[PDB]
Write a protein that binds this ligand. Structure first.
Ligand SMILES: N#Cc1ccc(N2CCN(Cc3ccc(COc4cccc5c4CN([C@H]4CCC(=O)NC4=O)C5=O)cc3)CC2)c(F)c1
Ligand SMILES: [Zn+2]
Length: 312
């Protein structure tokens, strides 16, 4: 590729002038902490994963302002339909105004996992969560990490973590799997146990389908390509604050193209998106990205929403 695999990770569609916070905050294990809960996101965050956010409502804008004064850390719960979650630490901040509307744009990172002990909704409607920090641990597993990396090569072609705990959350966050399996991987405390399950999951992986119809195969594990350092799967925020997880793939099937290619708010700079819908149900599965210059090495790719896809 000729693209910069570090620009998808900068989220420059959010504005190119953000504050940076370098400090870190790691709570101790078994510790019990009260943290604000992100109000609209319904995702399963993995430690290491990056969360882009676009906040408009006064209640949400004031919260994030109190987080910057305090820990800059909040809670993202894993919903079975919320007994576990992950913490997210803001590392970049930017305040905007549009027609007298205060917009906040934040970039956050998954940090530590937790088990919800108690929940509270407050006067502003923003929920708060009393969580016990779950532990990670020690140990090594090089045989496993190498067998998992052998399989990932038979799928696509040191962009991969070298630490068992870090590698385990990279597969957790980048494998094409159901949210029921992401939770299972998040309920484990040892990395060795997680890398094992993750190797089974991918040996039993299948094509991905349209979730609305369960009748069209859109793509497979062997078409996944990484155009970003983060990985083949990355979260992005649309113009209305809706965060999507996107699988980047070279070929997608059973999709129709609606509209003319556009560059506005593109998550992949230099490219242009066109809505792709299922050929049978017409449900929005994602977008087809196309290059604005003939010199760009990946001239076309697909970005598919993990929300519109179900494993076969
Ligand atoms: N309170 C308050 C408040 C809140 C929000 C305000 N405004 C929001 C809109 N902004 C102007 C605008 C208009 C129209 C468009 C067309 O594009 C759209 C439209 C709808 C959904 C999606 C996309 C693109 N897209 C993906 C495709 C893949 C990719 O690469 N990137 C993406 O984003 C989507 O999912 C873009 C920007 C101006 C600000 C505000 F003015 C006040
Ligand atoms: Zn369909």
């Amino acid at each position: 590729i000729n693209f910069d695999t570090s620009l998808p990770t900068s989220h420059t569609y959010l504005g190119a002038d953000m504050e940076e916070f370098h400090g870190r905050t790691l709570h101790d294990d078994d510790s019990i902490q009260v943290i604000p809960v992100l109000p609209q996101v319904m995702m399963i965050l993995v430690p290491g994963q990056t969360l882009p956010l676009q906040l408009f409502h006064p209640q949400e804008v004031s919260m994030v302002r109190n987080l910057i004064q305090n820990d800059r850390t909040f809670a993202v719960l894993a919903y079975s339909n919320a007994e576990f979650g992950t913490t997210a630490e803001i590392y970049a901040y930017r305040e905007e105004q549009d027609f007298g509307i205060e917009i906040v744009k934040v970039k956050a990172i998954g940090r530590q996992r937790f088990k919800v002990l108690e929940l509270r909704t407050q006067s502003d409607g923003i929920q708060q969560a009393k969580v016990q920090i779950l532990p990670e641990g020690s140990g090594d597993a090089e045989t496993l990490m190498d067998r998992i990396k052998k399989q990932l090569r038979e799928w696509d072609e040191d962009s991969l973590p070298s630490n068992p705990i870090d590698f385990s959350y990279w597969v957790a966050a980048n494998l094409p799997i159901d949210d029921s399996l992401r939770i299972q991987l998040l309920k484990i405390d040892s990395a060795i146990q997680r890398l094992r399950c993750e190797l089974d999951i991918m040996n039993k992986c299948t094509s991905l389908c349209c979730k609305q119809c369960q009748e069209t195969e859109i793509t497979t594990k062997n078409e996944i390509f990484s155009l970003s350092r983060e990985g083949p799967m990355a979260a992005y925020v649309n113009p209305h604050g809706y965060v999507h997880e996107i699988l980047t793939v070279y070929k997608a099937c059973n999709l129709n193209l609606i509209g003319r290619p556009s560059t506005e708010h593109s998550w992949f700079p230099g490219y242009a998106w066109t809505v792709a819908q299922c050929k049978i149900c017409a449900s929005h599965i994602g977008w087809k990205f196309t290059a604005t210059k003939k010199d760009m090495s990946p001239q076309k790719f697909w970005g598919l929403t993990r929300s519109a896809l179900i494993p076969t």
